[model samples]
Each structure stands twice: as C-alpha cells, then as structure tokens.
Target: KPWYFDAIGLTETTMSLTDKNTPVVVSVVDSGVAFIGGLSDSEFAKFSFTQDGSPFPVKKSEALYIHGTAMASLIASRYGIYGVYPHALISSRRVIPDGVQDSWIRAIESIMSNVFLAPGEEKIINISGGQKGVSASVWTELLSRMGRNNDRLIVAAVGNDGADIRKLSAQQRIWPAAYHPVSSVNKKQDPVIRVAALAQYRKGETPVLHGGGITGSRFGNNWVDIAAPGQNITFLRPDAKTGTGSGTSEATAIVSGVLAAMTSCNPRATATELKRTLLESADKYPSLVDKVTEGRVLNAEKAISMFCK
Candidate 1:
C-alpha cells in the first residue's frame, strides 16, 4: 500500500491536522460511479442527468464506470484503503455518458448553482477527461461566468494525447485542462488547477523524469501547472476488485484528494488562496522545471502546514 502522498510528504505523521472534518464537497464529473461490493456508499451523493431529447434521468452502467469508481476511492475510501481526505464527501455527476461538450456545460452550470453558496461551504471539482472541438470562445465564456464565484476550484487532467506539445496541434489539444485565460477575459475569476502525471519514483532514485504516463502531457512554460504520481495508482474497481492504473486521470484524482484535505483544514479558505498554497508549497524537481508551471510535485503536508500556520 505505498501511496504517492507519502512520497510527496502528505502522510498523517507530517500533516498538521489529523482527520480535520470540515465539510467539503468535491464534484467528480466522469463516466459514472458504480456501487460495487466492498465499497461504502455513505460518502456518495446521488444526482440526475439526461441525454439528448431524453425525459427524466437516465442510467448507463458499464465497466468504464470503474474509472470513476477508482477516482472516488482515491478521495474517500476508508475501508483498508487510505484516501488523502477520508472524511470528505463526493457528489458524482455522470456527464461523459451524454457528450463531452454537453457534459462540460452541464457540470459547470451545476457547480455555479449548487456548490459555492453559504459561508464555509466551499467546493472542489475534478475533471479527469477533456474534449477537443469545443468552442474556446464559448467555453471561456462559461469559465468567465464561473469565475464570478470565487468559492470553488477546479482540478483537471492534462490528458493522454500522446504528444509532447511539439507534435500536437492547437485543435488537437485538450480543453479545460489546458485552458489558460489571461486577465482580459475577466479580472475577478476563479482559477483552474491544471495537473500532469508524475511517474512514480522509489526511495534513493531521482524521481523518474517522464516515462510510463500519457504522452499527451504538455511541455514548456505555463503549459503544465503541477504534477502528481499517476502511474500504477491503486484503487477500487467497479467489480469490487483492486487494481492499478496509469494516466493523467489518476494524477488528477490525487490532486483532488490533496485539495480536499486543504478544504477540510481551512473551510473558509478562498479558491485563490487554495491555488496559491498549492503552488507555493509544491516540491520542485529539475526534470519537471521545463515541463510544468511550478516545475514541482504536489506537497500536501507542506500545504496543510502552511494553512494551519
């Protein structure tokens, strides 16, 4: 049960608070989360979704649902498996079943309406997949609107596009995960934390630079915001089985867990504060310096210590 968090200093021993139970809800927009054997349903909240021209809520269950199941387990699993924020709750939204663009719009609408209201009720969203062909103008407009509410934050996967920026074209790149907005759009806005996968490294080894992950991770300045251990991550499968997975998807889940922990410690922290804490506290690596914004890996223990200070 070796965890990436431990490698990056997020264990209970290093963190300032152990089991801080501030109520924080993380909305996970993915395929769908399934109720399988050996998984607890107490931490999940149910919501409804529909397809094009469909009446009422629709239910579509497939093995692919396991992807979401694992992501959820990484955030809240308590039985045998240890999540970064075990006490945090999750609101699962199955947007991928509908369509990429439609799902993104629906998810954003829900976050704007339901997530960040009342005092001390901040929210976090995890988007592990991205779509191409989405209108940047329209998508940025939605993001601009969501920016009005500063109580929520977004964590997205950079995608497994199989290109290192040089080979990939602009249209072929992923949206939302790779979307970086300048001040011209809106001066006051919430920010999205873009995440790339960090290959797992063992003790005494220079954390492997960039192997065994989605080739689609971006390189160069500001392209990648942060990196996390995404390869061979262990989680609960939809069939009630345990397995390991690799992708920016898994990397995104790990960052979501770290952010959830931050919310637990400082429920009143603003989205901008959370983003700053993460970036300022990250552990930098020379190999990653040229690849991501901070040239660093997530350091949960440092962020918590800084927040608690």
Candidate 2:
C-alpha cells in the first residue's frame, strides 16, 4: 500500500513533476540495493574497502539485504505502487556488514568522489544505520567535516532508541543524529538533517500519531529534529515481493526521497534553502506536540510547491 506516501501528500498531483525533476543521484548508504523493480546496473555505484576484502556495493544473494532494497524502492523505484521520484537514480553503498563508523566514512568518501566533482549537482546522501550506545564522536567529526560542502545534503536516521533513550545513560544515546547543525566554518551552510520516525496506519483510514513509532521519537529536549511516516510502512523487496517494517530508518528513507525530488525541481536550491523549505512547509500535528522540533510531519505537496514555484 502507498499509505505512507499519500499520508505525506505525495499524491499524483504533486508527483506529476517527477518527469520534470532534474536528474540528481541519491546515495543510499545502507545494506545494499538489489537489482529489482526499475533499478538498473547503470544506476548503481557500489563501494568496498580493502579491509572488508569482500565485494560489497554488490547485492549479496545470501540474505536478500531487504532493508536497502526496500529503502531504495521508496526513493526511486519505477515499479510497484510508486516512488517519490521515480526517475531519480540511486547510488547504493553497502556498509551494514562493517562498523557503522568506518563504513559510514567510506560511504561518504565514495559519494564525495562522485558528487563533489560537480558541486552544483545538489545530491543527497541517506544513512539509515546508527550505533546504539555512546556517541561516535570520530564519526560525528567526519560527518561535520563533510557537511561543510554545501552541494550534497546528509539525511540520517535518529535511531530506533526512542523507547530506551530515556532509560539509557547519556553516553548511550545515538550519535550523528544527535550531532545536528554539524560544525563548519560556514555554519549557515551546514548540510546534516536528523529524522525521527512517525506513526501511520494502513490506507483508507485516517492517520494518527500514536506511540506506535519508536519510543522517544518526540523532541522533548532530545536529538530528533523532524518526524516522518515509519510505522506500518509497506515497501518492495528484492524479489519483487512486499514487506512491512517500522523504524527511524524507514522514516529517513521517506525524507530522503522527498529531498531528492526537491533537488530535482530546484537544481539551484542550496542545502540550507532546501532544508528551510522542508521545515517551513511541514504540517504540524497536535499529537506530535513537543515530540518534534516543530511538531511537524513532512508535507510533500507543500514542500514541492514552495521550491518548485
């Protein structure tokens, strides 16, 4: 079902601009994107470090790597229900097998090699994995350094630790997501956005934000900045099958898809401008009050109208 998309205002009216979107590549730094749906060989750019000594970036047939495939479908799939930007291409950088810290750095380096070559490309890098305990400061520093470059926007999951975050020690809180507004000489141009999971039910029914999402997805002086649909989210598997999952990772993918479409519509939009538009156009929900920075959920149609105009 496309309930998640529709709940976020990704209807046919706004999605009609898919064809008009500029060709921008989004890097999904997750497990791996399977060659299913409309994802082709040309759309993929896999990466592997010498330490792993394994051919990653290539979808391993072992476990299906369902997470990456499902996330990719939400962003760019041309088959199934529909993608936020059906024509946008994805750069699949698999890093799930290794440490999130090291693998994430490698993924960013790989994307830099491609997108930084043309800084005006206005691309997006989506990271859905995060460590449970203790902030990875080393990784945070690396991300902060990367955020200095305004060409590519970095969108990461705030972690599924909402339920346990309060009970856990300060050091145990998730990182990268907690390190928002990544430090840079040009602070005004910082490009990191942390996304929390939002709750939505099956289609043909009104949507409501219950505690169904990760425990502490609300702001409440926490690291979460914004929230998006994550509960009961239906996505496509590598085998062309459908599956449902819940987590901030799934929510991150939805925000990434919308950002990709925004970049397509306004190729000249800077990361700062795009981020502002997304936040400003978001729809505030009473249920989300004090849970998120703006107590807002993503509004695709409003965001598209803001910059596309």
Best candidate, lDDT: 1
Q: Largest TM-score belongs to which candidate?
A: 1
Q: Per model, how many backbone clashes are there?
A: 1, 3
How close is every model to the real structure, measured as TM-score?
0.86, 0.83
lDDT by residue (tens digit), candidate 1, 1-309? 455766777766655573455576677777666545433753456454435532112336443557667787887676645666767676777666565456766766766776434433437788887667555876777776666656777788877744564456768767676566767545335468878876777533455434533443445556678888777788877667788777788888889888887777776778878888988898877767777765777887887777666
What TM-score does prediction 1 earn? Answer: 0.86
Worst 10 residues of 1 by lDDT: 50-59
Kindly give the stretch of ten consecutive residues in candidate 2 with the minimal lDDT sum. 212-221
Full-model lDDT for every candidate: 0.68, 0.67
Q: In lDDT terms, how accurate is model 2?
A: 0.67
